[model samples]
Target: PQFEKASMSKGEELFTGVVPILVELDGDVNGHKFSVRGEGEGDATNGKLTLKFICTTGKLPVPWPTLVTTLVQCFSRYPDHMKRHDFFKSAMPEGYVQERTISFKDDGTYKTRAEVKFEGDTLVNRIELKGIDFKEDGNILGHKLEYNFNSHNVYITADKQKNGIKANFKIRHNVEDGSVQLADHYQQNTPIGDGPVLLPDNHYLSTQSVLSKDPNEKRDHMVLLEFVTAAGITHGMDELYKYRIRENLYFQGATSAIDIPFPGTATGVIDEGNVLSAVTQGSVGRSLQDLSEATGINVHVVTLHRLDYGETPQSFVDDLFSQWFPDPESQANQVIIALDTVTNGTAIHYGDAVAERLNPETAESIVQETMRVPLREGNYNQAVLDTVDRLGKVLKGEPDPGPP
Candidate 1:
């Protein structure tokens, strides 16, 4: 896109008796211009022949390497197919072929569906690969791959974690020679950028907007940082959103760039036991941390998208607890406070085991009571701030100052 005046210079497709060939492509990409071309031969119908793919930069996508590396495998054994098998077996799988349909769930679970369709019956004997599960350490979604020996087609799908970009590859080969004779194509999508809220409610008001409206108490840093660490990132695959810094990025001033929404030290607390990162250092995180030390109970607050009254705050927290911490040890001494923007409500929870020690019912009631008054005046920042201060005092056994 950076360059100009580009178009495919030469492209063609042809058929020789029963075997067919197709080649096309010529274009520029950011000065790293590409000249792609491919030619297919070998009777796909006769099932025995050598097809070739020659490129300038100069290589076929992938699995192509495997096909070419094993040339001894090339050689047709069947007569040239008549029909739209025109030399191309377009009607359907005519002989024994293997099929495996791999799929992914929203939660990132990998599932395999396999069966062999043989000789016109669309059936073939097949077995599952042993090492096919999502790998340990970062492959939350298993590596995806597919191959059909009959049509000589292969496909690969990848869920990238480095920056959450997914990519794919497709190749067609001559089963006889195993040479990648054709590639479908390759492509990928781009990520998000900065300035005026690309995704609404997901970003803070633009810097100019914030400054114009509030003059001194814009709170862009706190609003942005708090949203990301609390509810911005999903601990798993539960939500569609995940926090990431933009390529152009953000700055406190002209030079100090914000690489991550929160400090690494705050991330460390979330990584270790008895802590959940929420709010900035001098706010709720400080209050919650001090509360943990003052009382034996540990507290974690999660800010979530607004919720409806259909599920009480406790019920909502119960669902989260089940997904995140099921073991009794992890469940002990844990208190969860949730701020629901949807219904303008706040809720607190401690498992039945810690209910006595934490006085969670009182804590829940107090936070809700304190949060309600500010919300009526439409002061969400104050509502949140007030809740943190009061929850800390109540957990420390300090007397309530009574609601405003």
Candidate 2:
């Protein structure tokens, strides 16, 4: 962003096959300038893997619907799968719909509209609220994008809380390594100086296609952020967007050079506890402090993505420990989660219990660290093996590693 220092070029050399999320970019970010193009090899008949993601904003839940309603669910002829879908979907059930579109024209004030419809279903399901500008708000959707611009259906954020100039995030699900890799490439191509800008509502969208999928692929999902700017940046990532800031990054008449949308605070009544006003400092960046208060967990959540949503069992560990260690004695630092299309729950490796305590930002950090760290760093393991001996000690109060 123009208001900030330019990202150091040498830093680019630090990538260990893992990309850094917050490297400084050049220019100002405001409107839309995103494009997407991706391809795969081997099974050329299946088509290539390519996608374009636009940066967009959203508001809180409007037209109230359950969270589960905001996702792609699989309902094949298989009975068990149907049952699994039914169970999780039912837990927070939402009926299926084909394609439907809704739009909001608040023009920098108020929320964007969200609507969904199944292919065979007739009725439309929707939600609405004041949309937020991420440069002014925060990334709310986690790993989904949806906002249509002109006529292109792009990736939309999960709920409100998603915003950004279009960005290009590259992810690889290595079948051989059983490890995933990501590269978040961003550059200042727009003019506004890249401080903060409004992503088009129509720009938020999602897509599905028939392509190569590895059931046992080690790495899973790749979430890339994209966007454009006015005075800071000129134009790029119209969908799949960049790398490097153009000129020196500094600001003169910069208004607000932030991309956090959520503002102020929240006052909610505790249903169980007798309290009239629960003063929760509102946040675009929901911190560990806030989530701990919200979810009742002392840890943070570590989120992971996969190309395939299926059953896959994997393990890891330190040199002192042998392979295939028991869950309890794995001595793993964190959890390894696989997206679960079945249980409606993310598959858990080790450290899952701790993940429950994570805030979204921290979750991103955890994942980054997971990739950056090596087995030599600590007694690290990817598996979520529960340490019984460690647990007993903790029950008496300790963060110690004991015998398996």
Candidate 3:
């Protein structure tokens, strides 16, 4: 099926909605390279659809737990995709045998059923339904069904030469009541059994609510990227950003100055005043813009409320640099200065071409001394402006002002 350009979130380059579903992801996990391709079509008006996904790796025996978790996490962001598929089709021809398989594991319990049709010893078509019962009560359970007519292989865990297999499935869910319910068919003769009326996990439940507020609502780019990273879908920032750009997805320009903890103030307890005031933000933004235009080197400043979970200042900047400029050739004139306001951690990352003029010692002093001096006084405005001014001078071949 041809993929048509779909509508993307306004002012956000995170995700989009495309018809005749097509998703291609090339990523890695645990030092293994893997790729996933999923395509399918559904007719919401007619309540019918067929979909298939294949994940292949250089090694054998694909990591089922990680891959499935990634798929669920990634797809849950686009609830429209989940809503369009209809898994409760009522008709099936005779000469088919239905088999049920169940498993109890440490993580959860799973039950699957398959209906197969054969043409004289050759498998022709099949339909499968699976339910995942999470171990913790009140934790959302999951259910999905698939109708496979084209592929001979159906199981995701089956080992193959490529350590992967093709799977065809449809996600089943209903949001008519403003709450998502994953269907669980535990009894015979009922398409949707009264097993467990589960809600989506809190993460996606909030996401769905946000989507409900505005169908085209914009989401934070970093949050979406972090979600992908957390899901283990993309091994590194390079792959993550590259995948977005390659798919023509929306992403904020790298040159933009970013400030986190939106509204620039803490709501509760410690005000700390970690974010810059509006006027200061404007000044810093203008200075950084001038520096980039004059030097032809993009210097991006990003102040975050805190570093990402388990990330240091250096690691944060390095990851962000890779995200903004994934290709080394394109990275030559790129630089990123990041700060974690909560921890007062700061780091600078620059490309090789920029390194020719700006040495590591200078960079360290810029963050540790130039920026930290104002930061130590809780003058976020001064910290950002001073850092920008010093960076401007260095990039323009002017003498270093030395930290005040």
Candidate 4:
């Protein structure tokens, strides 16, 4: 079978479809931390936002009146900024620090001190001081606190002197003019797997905005799924799938014979025969189907002519696995077998349910001996077929069919 590229019209249709994007904002004001968790849907021309700001430090009210006022103002401004601009993408320099002080003359003299720190232009740490020795009937009350920002939320830690203090101050306004990216896709270049398994290059999957067809549309926040190719060219899945339907590239075969929902197309295969021939592909697919039918565990296979730039077969399988099955429930009984024909690299990934039946040693054997032996002999088809046969037997509680 010939591998076909997806047509431009079809690519455009998929690009215009709406996908929800999530943005999480975490930072500190004064010493109290706040979080803005929101989701928005963006299409070709427009986008909508839904957000809520909550004090991550618990329900205890902010004791400092000035800090409360600042927080209220900051919260009110966020929605507007997000709607009017790609506020999160704005520029802020790393290791940046800002400090300011505010004085009040109500009932008695008091001062509030604030400082904020940034790393990679994102808010990371902050400190606040309030009522520094403020006199009230010869009694003194003061507070010194710190805030740390993390991916999920902001954490607050108080100085030892304020250990017994119950009051919490909210709002450090240094973030008013700041910005952060929605996601950081870059990851450390790390090696994976034992010998014989092809170690793919270091690479990551990232998304980029697809520009609107109409130049006049100001909302251009629609993101398309893209990954780097071995040739260093960036291509969207639409570009790749345009040649094939999403199902053909990643088949989710029937759970059982009685429920053979996709009789015609459910092959549990993912290659256009740049590596394995049509006859071999069919044999492997049938073996995978038999395994799924007897054990009720879905097995998937993916064969790539070459991997993305800096991608190993393992990383590619992991990336695609997560994309296809985002939640644990959907991934409960799934298994994926991926191969890069260029390097004859192989990787096997299974869900929690499959893990209960197949241990890691057996899995490694499937990749190393059962599959790699045929691959070493240049028999790609037999390698995949034998691997699936052994996988089925193990899932069915049969004895281990040691590698051929």
Instruction: Please report the candidate that would top TM-score against the real structure.
Output: 4
Model 2 global lDDT (CA atoms, 0 to 1):
0.22
Better of 2 and 3 by lDDT: 3
Candidate 3 lDDT, tens digit per residue, 1-404?
44323322221112123224343445432233445554444332222333454554433122222222222212233233222111111111122223333232333333433332223422222333333444333222221211111111111111111111122222233333444323221211111222211111111111111011123524211011111110111224345664555311121111212223222211111112236666776776677667667877777677754544456888867766666566788686777777766446789988877887898888899999888887554566677788888978998889988877
Against the true structure, candidate 4 reaches a TM-score of 0.36
Q: Looking at model 1, which ten-residue stretch has the lowest summed lDDT?
A: 222-231
TM-score of each: 0.32, 0.22, 0.34, 0.36
Candidate 2, residue 404: how far the Cα is off, in Å: 24
lDDT, model 1: 0.34
Q: What global local distance difference test value does model 4 have? A: 0.41
TM-score of 2: 0.22
Question: Which runs in model 1 stand beyond 4 Å of their true positions?
Answer: 1-281, 308-312, 352-354, 358-361
Q: Residues 261-332, candidate 2: write the lDDT tens digits.
A: 212222111111111112221221243334335533222122221112232312211111122223543323
* Candidate 4, poorest ten consecutive residues by summed lDDT: 158-167
Q: Write the per-residue lDDT of candidate 4 for residues 1-404, one digit (tens) a residue.
A: 34323222221222234433333334343343444332333342222222222334453222222232112000111122122111111111111122223333222222322222223312332333333323332211222221212212111111111111011222232122252212111111111112121121111111111211234523322222211111112225346756554321221211111221222233378662245678877787677778777778888777665554467767777776776677888685788787766457788888879888999998989987888777764567777778888888898889988877
lDDT of every model, 2 decimals: 0.34, 0.22, 0.41, 0.41
Among all windows of ten consecutive residues in candidate 3, which has the lowest summed lDDT? 221-230
Q: How many collisions between residues are there in candidate 2?
A: 108
